[PDB]
């Protein structure tokens, strides 16, 4: 419960709220305190962690939900494991990677995404889940080099047994930088569950690009950069994204030095197969996981 947690330092702040390192019984925990404008995401994520009972070594480990009243307002808390290395966005700016380190990160992310997408049938089986806002800032780096996925407030669920679709009721929109072309020009079929899985794939390809840039080969390595850093400004608008992703059909450039390394070359082909304008031509999360397991 919140009254037993000592907030020790703020490690994040934004439109979503803020993220704190706290102590509970003398050991670290992560507390996300949701902004007023993002209450729906707390409700959605509490449903997944509590009712569906989501857990997996590549999904941020849940501890508890709670409401606490403070300063004459009521706050919505989400308490989870603490990872001192921060998010992949922070980690990649402080270190380069070797071949084995680079492959763990991208294999563990694909392993997390596959768990979400795949339905487990039976008595109390988890439905299929699409994330819908995957990015490097809501993926965490664990001390064993593997990653885990967080920030599930936009998720959509599906069960083929009943074949009903639960899109929830959240006014939040995805991060514009990572938006997929069928989103930016409003052709995505909102009634078909596969549509949301193919959105996660597009975003996964971008994160794969972000990480591969940091792997060293033959003494060469790129600085960290976010997707489309060279053609859109910070906090880009819906219109900016569409000009780049739809009108000009642009994609993150493949650095030429990648073509003198066998791992980076196999990862480049995988990226491009996540980036088709035609959403149904993209690979599945399971396909990606399998391919990454055989690359070395
Ligand atoms: N933008 C955006 C959305 N991000 C999140 O919702 C989010 C971010 C982080 C965590 C989270 C979870 C567990 N542990 C941690 N640890 C953490 C440690 C260091 C940092 N720092 C980043 C800034 O500089 C100092 C290190 C951030 C998070 N974060 C959970 C949700």
Swiss-Prot record:
Subcellular localization(s) per the UniProt record: Membrane
Species annotation: Homo sapiens
Cytoplasmic side stretches: 1-296
Any one GO BP annotation for this protein: dorsal/ventral pattern formation
Full-protein interval shown: 204 to 499 of 509
UniProt-recorded name of the protein: Activin receptor type-1
A GO cellular component annotation in the UniProt record: apical part of cell
Effect of residue 153 to D: In FOP; variant phenotype
UniProt keyword annotation of Kinase present: yes
């Amino acid at each position: 419960v919140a009254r037993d947690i000592t907030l020790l330092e703020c490690v994040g702040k934004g439109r979503y709220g803020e993220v704190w390192r706290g102590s509970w019984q003398g050991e670290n925990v992560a507390v996300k305190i949701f902004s007023s404008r993002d209450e729906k995401s707390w409700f959605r994520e509490t449903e997944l962690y509590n009712t569906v009972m989501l857990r997996h070594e590549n999904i941020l480990g849940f501890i508890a939900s709670d409401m606490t009243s403070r300063h004459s307002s009521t706050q919505l808390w989400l308490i989870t494991h603490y990872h001192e290395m921060g998010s992949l966005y922070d980690y990649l700016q402080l270190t380069t990677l070797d071949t084995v380190s680079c492959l763990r990160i991208v294999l563990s992310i694909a392993s997390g995404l596959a768990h979400l997408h795949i339905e487990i049938f039976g008595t109390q089986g988890k439905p299929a889940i699409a994330h819908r806002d995957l990015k490097s800032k809501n993926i965490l780096v664990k001390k064993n080099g593997q990653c885990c996925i967080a920030d599930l407030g936009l998720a959509v669920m599906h069960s083929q047994s009943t074949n009903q679709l639960d899109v929830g009721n959240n006014p939040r929109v995805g991060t514009k930088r990572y938006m997929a072309p069928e989103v930016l020009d409003e052709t995505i079929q909102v009634d078909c569950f596969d549509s949301y899985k193919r959105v996660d794939i597009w975003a996964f390809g971008l994160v794969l690009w972000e990480v591969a840039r940091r792997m060293v080969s033959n003494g060469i390595v790129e600085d960290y950069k976010p997707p489309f850093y060279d053609v859109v400004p910070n906090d880009p608008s819906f219109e900016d994204m569409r000009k780049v992703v739809c009108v000009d059909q642009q994609r993150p450039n493949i650095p030429n030095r990648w073509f003198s390394d066998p791992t980076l070359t196999s990862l480049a082909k995988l990226m491009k197969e996540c980036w088709y304008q035609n959403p149904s031509a993209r690979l599945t999360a399971l396909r990606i996981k399998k391919t990454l397991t055989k690359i070395d």
